[model samples]
Target: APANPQNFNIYKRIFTDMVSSPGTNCAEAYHSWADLRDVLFNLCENLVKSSEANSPAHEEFKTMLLIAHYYATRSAAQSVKQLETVAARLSVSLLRHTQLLPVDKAFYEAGIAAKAVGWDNMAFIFLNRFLDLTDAIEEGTLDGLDHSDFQDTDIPFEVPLPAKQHVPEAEREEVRDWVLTVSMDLEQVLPRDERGAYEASLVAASTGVRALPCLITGYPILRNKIEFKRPGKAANKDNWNKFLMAIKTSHSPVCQDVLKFISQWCGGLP
Candidate 1:
C-alpha cells in the first residue's frame, strides 16, 4: 500500500490547507490550490507508472484527491468544462464496487465533486447514489461498513454523517421514503416527454428537495465552502439553513456532529 505521510498529506492537502494560516481570519489559500492539484496529479501518475495495479486503498485516495482537485478548481479558480471528465472518472471509480473502501465519504465527496463540475445531471446522480448508499447501510445490504481505510483528514470536513444516528428517530423513517422515492419510477413521478426537463429539475432538486434526503440521511457535519455560500441568498444557502434547523433546532435531540460542522462553517455556533 505505498501509503506514506506525504501520500496521505498530499491526498488531503487541499482542504487541510484551504487557508493561508492555520486558523482565524487567515488569508485565502487559493493559490496553493492549483499547486496541490498538480502535485497530486503527478503523484497519481507515478503510482500508476510504478505499479501495474494500484491497491484498492491507493486507488480510493487517488481518485478522491483528483476529484477534489477538479471541484476546488471549479469554485476557487477556473470553472472548466473538463470537470465533466473528472466527474466521469469519479463516477466510474465509485461503481467499481469490487474494490472495498467502506467509506461512504467517497460517495458524498463525489456528489459534491459532480455538483461542482457539472452543476446538473452528474450531481443529481452521484448525490442520489449517496442517498441509496446510506439507505443500504441503515437497512441491511451494506452492514459492517467501517472506514478504517480513511483517516478523518482524508476529506475536507469531518467524517461523513451516513453511519450515524442523530436524526429525530421519528423523522428518519419518513425521510427515507422521500429519498427512496426519487430513485424510483421518476418516469411516472415526472412529467411525460420532458425527460430533458426532468433531468434539469432533478439536478435542481438534488440541491434542494433531494438535499434533505441526502444530507440528513447521513447526519453529516458539513463543509464550510458549501455552507457559507455568498450573500446567504444562494439556493444552497437557504437549503443549508433549512437543513441546519431540522436537526439542530432547540426541538431536536442528541445532535452529535451539528455543532462540530456548523461551528467551523459559520465561524462558531454563537
Candidate 2:
C-alpha cells in the first residue's frame, strides 16, 4: 500500500514546532525532534520499499530523513550513530545528483558524526566527497556558494542560510577548514607512498569510480597489501583491534567478508 499521505501533516507539525520553539525551550525542542524521527523513518522506508525508489518522492523522503535524523540525534542527545547509519544507508550516487546545499550539508554532518564515533574510514569517504564539492564551489564548477536547487524542492528544508539563493557560504568555509584538518591528521598516520593509493581507494569505493569496499571494514583494501588475513593466518593485532573497536561501536553490521575473515584468523577478537 502507498504510504499514508496524512503522515506528512505529522511531519510538518512536529518539524515546525521543533523549529518554532525558543532556545530556552530546549527540552521541548528535543522532544519534538525525537517525535519526528519515527515518522520520518517510516515514511522513508515506505517510499523505498513500496516501489517508489528513485522517484522524485524518494529523493525528497530520503533527503528529509537524513536531515531529520541529523537533528534528532543532536537535539535528543542520542548517539550520532543514528545519523551515521542513515548516512551510510543512503547512497552518494543519489546525493551527488542534487544541488540542494542542505542535503550536501547533511552529508558533511555525517562525515563529522562518523569521525566522532571513530569511524575514520567512513568519515573520510564522506569528507572526501565534500572536499571535492567544496573545491567545485570554489572553482566555479558547482553552483553551491551563490545558488542552489532548494527553490525547486518538493519538501521544505528550513536550515537557516546566509541569504536567498545562496548555499551557506560560511558553513562551507568552515567545513573546508575542517576537511583540511582531517586530511592533515590522516596524512600523519598513513605512509607517504601509500597516501595516494589510500585516497584513491576511498574515492573509488565511495563514488563508484573503480572499486568495491574491503571484505572486512567497508574500506577499499588497496592492491598488493598484506593487511587482510588469509585462512588460519593471524591478523595484524594492532589494526585488528582498531577494526574490532570500530565494528563494535559504530552499530553498523559486520559485513559477511569480515565475519568470514574473523573465523579464518588464527587469533580471535578480544
Question: Against the true structure, whose lDDT is highest?
Answer: 2
Model 2: weakest 10-residue lDDT segment is 146-155
Clashing pairs in 2: none
State in Å the error of residue 72, model 1. 3.2
| Cα distance off (Å), candidate 2, residue 39 | 5.9
Give me the runs in candidate 1 sitting further than 4 Å from their true place.
Answer: 1-36, 42-65, 76-128, 138-185, 188-270
Tens digit of lDDT per residue, candidate 1, span 1-270?
Answer: 576743555555453344212211101333354445455556666666667336874566555544434333322312223223333333323332213233343454444544455444444444454555566657755543433222211122232334442223443444345446654642222221122223212222223332111122221122222433312211234334543454444432222232232343335433
Q: How far off is residue 48 in model 1, in Å?
A: 9.6
TM, every model: 0.30, 0.34
Q: Which 10 successive residues of model 1 have the least lDDT summed?
A: 211-220
- The count of residue-pair clashes in candidate 1 stands at 1
